[PDB]
Amino acid sequence: FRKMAFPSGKVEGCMVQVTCGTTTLNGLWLDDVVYCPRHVICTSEDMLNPNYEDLLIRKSNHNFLVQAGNVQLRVIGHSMQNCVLKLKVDTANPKTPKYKFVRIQPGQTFSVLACYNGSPSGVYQCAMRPNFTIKGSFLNGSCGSVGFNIDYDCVSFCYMHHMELPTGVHAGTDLEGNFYGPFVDRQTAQAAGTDTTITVNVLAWLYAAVINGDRWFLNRFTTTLNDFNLVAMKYNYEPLTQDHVDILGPLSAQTGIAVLDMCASLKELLQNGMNGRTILGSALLEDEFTPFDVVRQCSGV
Amino acid sequence: FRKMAFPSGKVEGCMVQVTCGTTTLNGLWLDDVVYCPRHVICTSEDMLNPNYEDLLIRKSNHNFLVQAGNVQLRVIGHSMQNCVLKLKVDTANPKTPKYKFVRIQPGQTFSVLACYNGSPSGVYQCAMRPNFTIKGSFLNGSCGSVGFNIDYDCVSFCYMHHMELPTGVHAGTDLEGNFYGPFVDRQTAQAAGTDTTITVNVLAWLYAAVINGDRWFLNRFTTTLNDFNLVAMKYNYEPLTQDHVDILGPLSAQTGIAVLDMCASLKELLQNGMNGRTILGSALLEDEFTPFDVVRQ
Ligand SMILES: CC(C)(C)c1ccc(N(C(=O)c2c[nH]cn2)[C@@H](C(=O)NC2CCCCC2)c2cccnc2)cc1
Numbered sequence: 390f391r392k393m394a395f396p397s398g399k400v401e402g403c404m405v406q407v408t409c410g411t412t413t414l415n416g417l418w419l420d421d422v423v424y425c426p427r428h429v430i431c432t433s434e435d436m437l438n439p440n441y442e443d444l445l446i447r448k449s450n451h452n453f454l455v456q457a458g459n460v461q462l463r464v465i466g467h468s469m470q471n472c473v474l475k476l477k478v479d480t481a482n483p484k485t486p487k488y489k490f491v492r493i494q495p496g497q498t499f500s501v502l503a504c505y506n507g508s509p510s511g512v513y514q515c516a517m518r519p520n521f522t523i524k525g526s527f528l529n530g531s532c533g534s535v536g537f538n539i540d541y542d543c544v545s546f547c548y549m550h551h552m553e554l555p556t557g558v559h560a561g562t563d564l565e566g567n568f569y570g571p572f573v574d575r576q577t578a579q580a581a582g583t584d585t586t587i588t589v590n591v592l593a594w595l596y597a598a599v600i601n602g603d604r605w606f607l608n609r610f611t612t613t614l615n616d617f618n619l620v621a622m623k624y625n626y627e628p629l630t631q632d633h634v635d636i637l638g639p640l641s642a643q644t645g646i647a648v649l650d651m652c653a654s655l656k657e658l659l660q661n662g663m664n665g666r667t668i669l670g671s672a673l674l675e676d677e678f679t680p681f682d683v684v685r686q687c688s689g690v
Numbered sequence: 691f692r693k694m695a696f697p698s699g700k701v702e703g704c705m706v707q708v709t710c711g712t713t714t715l716n717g718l719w720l721d722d723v724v725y726c727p728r729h730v731i732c733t734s735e736d737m738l739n740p741n742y743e744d745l746l747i748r749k750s751n752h753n754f755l756v757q758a759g760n761v762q763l764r765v766i767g768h769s770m771q772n773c774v775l776k777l778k779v780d781t782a783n784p785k786t787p788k789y790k791f792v793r794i795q796p797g798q799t800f801s802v803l804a805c806y807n808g809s810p811s812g813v814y815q816c817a818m819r820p821n822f823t824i825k826g827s828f829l830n831g832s833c834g835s836v837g838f839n840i841d842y843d844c845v846s847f848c849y850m851h852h853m854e855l856p857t858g859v860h861a862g863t864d865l866e867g868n869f870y871g872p873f874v875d876r877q878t879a880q881a882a883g884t885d886t887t888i889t890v891n892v893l894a895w896l897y898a899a900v901i902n903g904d905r906w907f908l909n910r911f912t913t914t915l916n917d918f919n920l921v922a923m924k925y926n927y928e929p930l931t932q933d934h935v936d937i938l939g940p941l942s943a944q945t946g947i948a949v950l951d952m953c954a955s956l957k958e959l960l961q962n963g964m965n966g967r968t969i970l971g972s973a974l975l976e977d978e979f980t981p982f983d984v985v986r987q
Pocket residue numbers: 412413414428429431436527528529530531532551552553554573574575576577
């Protein structure tokens with residue numbers, strides 16, 4: 390059981406470089422529009438309190454150099470949608486996949502294609518934390534990299550990278566420029582809130598463990614939703630809802646362990662630790678696999 | 691710090707489905723050649739003692755059904771090279787990337803594009819274990835999925851997947867069909883040898899933790915190389931060679947921590963564990979990042 394990213398080819402063909410004056414980052418080229426963070430028009434001076442509407446009124450089309458690999462794309466228009474800049478270019482991307490823009494919920498996972506200077510560098514599986522940050526691997530100039538899911542030939546873009554927070558976690562927007570989390574695209578003292586662990590994902594991962602070899606953490610007992618959430622609160626775990634329990638239905642049936650059965654196992658794990666054991670490859674309880682991830686991975690979708 | 695894989699697009703455009711008899715698996719379509727495990731020609735009771743030369747001589751071109759997405763590829767010739775079958779096809783792959791075939795050594799990392807029925811399922815980063823196995827995520831029909839690196843748009847193919855071993859780990863070949871390790875493409879009693887931790891990689895990852903702002907595991911000691919190895923082998927760590935020490939030189943110089951000083955830290959880490967702490971987000975000592983991977987990330 391590995392953390393698996395989606396194959397990234399459909400997205401690699403959309404990655405371009407966008408330079409505005411002195412700053413370079415990545416953009417997403419879909420049909421004849423390039424999408425990138427609006428903070429690309431910010432200068433090392435504007436950083437503290439940019440007036441983005443004013444900075445954009447200043448700009449003309451020629452202020453943006455867009456390069457797809459080695460071909461320069463002519464910019465014929467520019468506009469802002471919330472925190473994303475939209476550069477109209479004269480050529481539709483002939484590699485544009487079937488795609489949707491979607492906004493995901495905390496606890497949902499996606500693949501990230503990390504890019505630098507418009508060139509794909511690596512791909513990894515990530516999760517939207519409950520505090521709306523991404524524990525990504527992003528260096529300087531990674532802005533404009535996107536997160537995505539694929540559903541049988543359709544790429545659902547859910548994340549565009551904007552900034553790093555002082556704890557080294559990351560903040561970005563959906564592809565309509567709406568931020569995930571209470572963060573702003575300027576130089577400020579903002580910090581991620583206290584994060585919590587994605588309980589339904591830990592349960593899914595325990596089901597994935599049982600599906601493979603590891604069964605040592607199971608017991609004969611059951612808990613209640615109320616009793617378990619009292620422990621969840623103590624350990625800064627997200628509360629578990631009847632909806633979570635239903636989502637875990639398929640895995641409960643496959644394995645013969647009911648959700649509150651598994652909650653009893655996890656509750657024991659939270660207090661007594663793992664007593665030297667591991668569960669899959671990990672001494673930690675993993676929470677970046679969704680119920681759907683576990684079934685897709687254990688079924689070869 | 692993520693275990694990140696190479697972008698998979700250049701490899702995606704090469705994956706095809708190969709069918710022989712009732713058996714389907716994946717092939718790698720480069721130029722006018724499809725590469726796949728030769729055990730696609732094995733029958734359900736050939737599995738214990740197949741004679742592949744005899745099995746192959748009885749096949750003609752049209753016994754191989756090659757499908758690239760929706761289009762059937764016409765097989766015009768076939769030959770066997772060690773444990774890989776090479777099917778010559780009608781058409782050169784237009785999506786063929788710049789590529790090379792490389793054989794890697796234990797401890798090296800690579801990306802795997804897991805595929806089923808010729809279609810890519812997922813991508814993940816992997817390491818070749820000292821016992822020549824791969825701790826992969828592979829299900830039935832994964833055979834012929836490949837492992838690779840990419841460097842300056844050139845794809846280095848280093849692994850083709852062949853089989854599952856009893857412990858749940860995986861064995862395969864280079865793209866010339868030579869197995870990694872003492873395994874054979876045949877149903878037997880074979881089992882992976884005792885595995886060990888890739889010591890040079892753990893040290894690389896400790897250097898990565900220091901390049902990020904984490905110094906908590908360092909100490910004021912040093913060690914000789916022989917004393918380090920005598921201790922580390924008691925935890926099933928691979929011996930650290932002078933080659934390994936030279937290879938870490940760049941990370942040592944970037945961080946100002948002598949290689950044998952980092953070895954002293956590791957020795958103490960093995961003795962104490964983590965005491966409820968984390969290094970680069972992990973509660974275990976991570977060994978599937980190489981000195982090269984740390985510099986890149
Ligand atoms: C304009 C604005 C909003 C202040 C800004 C400035 C720099 C960047 N960062 C670029 O790397 C970058 C930006 N444009 C080209 N490159 C880095 C970044 O977030 N530093 C933050 C630290 C101080 C507080 C705000 C910025 C970065 C991003 C991702 C991974 N590691 C480092 C992101 C946003």
